[PDB]
């Protein structure tokens, strides 16, 4: 048993998890009312990775759903799918309205609805025979998912300090600072709880999403629902060796293991190549295995912003490369040979780098059993540049005198502004100090 | 002559047929200005009636797939789940009652990781 209770949380974080369940039904080879396609057991090996085990071929999602908005969770319960959901192991059906639209609203609501919020992950762990852990799919954008998501980071690591913690933190829009001007306060606050109550995070930056989303999809402008599509593909790409077989990192607590050098350097660069709409005219003649994994380590698929002027001033140490489908698996090691020759992988200046490669056979589903997929989950020392970008915006903002008495509306009547400044500059240094 | 008479022994130790040919037995050879062709064409012909026999019915092609599938550990997801159940059995300083418990724990994770054919995978016997 490798039972994950995913905690999908937030105003954007519910919506990115709505399409996360829509991604799984077409690739498990199943219709949401029962096993009626028999490609379901032959194609996908583990139909209870993010579901309960069959009790008559009925499946219950291991997602729980709290938000301060009732509109986001009603956008799951009124969708073409609805009996796939079962709201009595998920969420008690009807969850009220918030105060709301503050970080400090969702943060005290953990403290008074602490009995009920930790009694709904024990109504789905009543079919787990040994729980793996919790993956916190909570958005640092909105104060809704970030309020309740900052609570569950503390409390899941002291009543469950033996279980996995690891988050899909998708950050506020950095361009903005005239829309979401509450961005430096609420973003940094959740990051304090991630650097000492979590050992890995997977960070995603939202301004870097739209760099890849109009270079590959070629849409006029990415909207909110055309930005949730790009996100649901990299969630379902990241957990493939837990539902399909590999010999390498076949546990998620395997996957995570090879990507953390040290606590306070674990902020992971994600990259994911195949989102082009004329991939289809190049899957018919085969673009060779030798050069469909020498284009992931080159930035033109990245989701985490970095310069082009600081990529030889930093060095990767551990880089994970999950290939999906059959690719011709015997020149995959001939391809990673050509990585050192180019020097697309950098090596630390006191040791060697490591490129963990894994592979898997896949269920019948034509955008993935005929079209090679490459997911990179790197761990690069260039990640402080984001922290230099937020820090330079955080100390400038506190000199506006904005949100130092308008953030104080609720459950902050004390000074913790300079703690946040200090915990970001300790992070930035223990990253930089690692490499000589 | 040696090898033909081995393939004819495979059939004598099979029950589905006791012979290779059913179209070389309408012919009789008895040659000596052409022994070389008759012996050889009765040899590949016995070989061709045994090559389709393994591929079809005996399903050698699925047989060597499965033998390759477990031992290299390419049903990996299953073998890391069941190894976590195994490391709990190494907690006991070895006994004789180990494998009878482990072939029990074999069918636990087999349905957890929901492998493509669970009765074909009940042939993995766990030795001590």
From Swiss-Prot, chain A:
Biological processes per GO annotation: cytoplasmic microtubule organization; meiotic spindle organization; microtubule nucleation; mitotic cell cycle; mitotic sister chromatid segregation; mitotic spindle organization
SUPFAM superfamilies, per database record: Tubulin C-terminal domain-like, Tubulin nucleotide-binding domain-like
Gene Ontology cellular component annotations, sorted alphabetically: centrosome; cytoplasm; gamma-tubulin complex; gamma-tubulin ring complex; mitotic spindle microtubule; nucleus; polar microtubule; spindle
Binding positions for GTP per the UniProt entry: 141-147
Keywords from the named record: Cytoplasm, Cytoskeleton, GTP-binding, Microtubule, Nucleotide-binding
Coiled coil: none
GO MF entry, a single one: GTP binding
Subcellular localization: Cytoplasm, Cytoskeleton, Microtubule organizing center, Centrosome; Cytoplasm, Cytoskeleton, Spindle
Keyword Ubl conjugation: no
First-listed, main subcellular location of the protein, grouped into a coarse class: cytoplasm
Function: Tubulin is the major constituent of microtubules. The gamma chain is found at microtubule organizing centers (MTOC) such as the spindle poles or the centrosome, suggesting that it is involved in the minus-end nucleation of microtubule assembly.
PANTHER family with a match to the protein in the record: TUBULIN
Family according to the record: Belongs to the tubulin family.
Protein name: Tubulin gamma-1 chain
Gene source species: Xenopus laevis (African clawed frog)
Gene: tubg1
